[PDB]
Amino acid sequence: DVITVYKDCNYTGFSGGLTIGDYNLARLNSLGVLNDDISSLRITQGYQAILYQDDNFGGASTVINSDNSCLNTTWNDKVSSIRVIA
Amino acid sequence: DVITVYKDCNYTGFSGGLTIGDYNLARLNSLGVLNDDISSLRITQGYQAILYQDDNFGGASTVINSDNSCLNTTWNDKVSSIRVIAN
Ligand SMILES: [Ca+2]
Ligand SMILES: [Ca+2]
Ligand SMILES: [Ca+2]
Ligand SMILES: [Ca+2]
Ligand SMILES: [Ca+2]
Incomplete structure (x- = not known):
């Protein structure tokens, strides 16, 4: 995986690994990742995650192009779909 | 390279790529990385960097087990050797 999304801040809590591609809510759920729940994420250099409110x-x-240990109030527990690209 | 060390904060400035192993100042210099100069680091999941003052x-x-965009007062422009290990 090149992106890992965590339930809690500081890269803790249930996590889901992502590779290049599109992840709507259903796909995130298939990884056990919940809607409006992600709080931090790791981004492997050379990749980036585009977070979407809906x-x-x-x-x-x-x-997000670098590890974020705790999303701000606008993005914490608000992500519903993600696109990962090089 | 599972770890990249940057001269400036926010992952900018001259950078050096590191892999598993030990880097004394001599080895850092062989990559063009200077003493008491590193300010930020990108670290690939599954790996980590142990920084040393001397x-x-x-x-x-x-x-440093996750990207650090700007080392604090205790570590900024103070790193003299580094060891990269699995995480
Ligand atoms: Ca959360
Ligand atoms: Ca990273
Ligand atoms: Ca949402
Ligand atoms: Ca510096
Ligand atoms: Ca030093």
């Missing part, structure tokens, strides 16, 4: 890559978005 | 792994140490 499912199916809709709503406001933000790009 | 050369040859001497003095105080600290572990």
Whole structure:
């Protein structure tokens, strides 16, 4: 995996590993990752995660290109879909 | 390279790529990385960097197990040797 999303801040709690591709809520759930639940994530250099407020890559978005130990109030427990790219 | 050390904060400036192993100042210099100069580091999941205040792994140490965009006052521009190990 090149991206790992964690339930709690500081890279702890249930985690899901992601590789290049698109992850709507259903796909995140298949990994055990819940909606409006991610709080931190690791980004392997050379990759990035585009976070989306709504499912199916809709709503406001933000790009994470380095490990984030605790998402801010706008993004913490708000992610519903993610796109991972090189 | 599972670990990249940068000259400046926010992963910018001259960078050196490190893999599993031990890096005294001599080895860091062979990569162009200077003494008391590192300010940020990217660390690939599954690996970690043990920083040392002095050369040859001497003095105080600290572990960087996730990207650090700007070392604190105690470690910024103070690293003299590093060891990369599995995490
Ligand atoms: Ca959470
Ligand atoms: Ca990383
Ligand atoms: Ca949401
Ligand atoms: Ca510096
Ligand atoms: Ca030093």
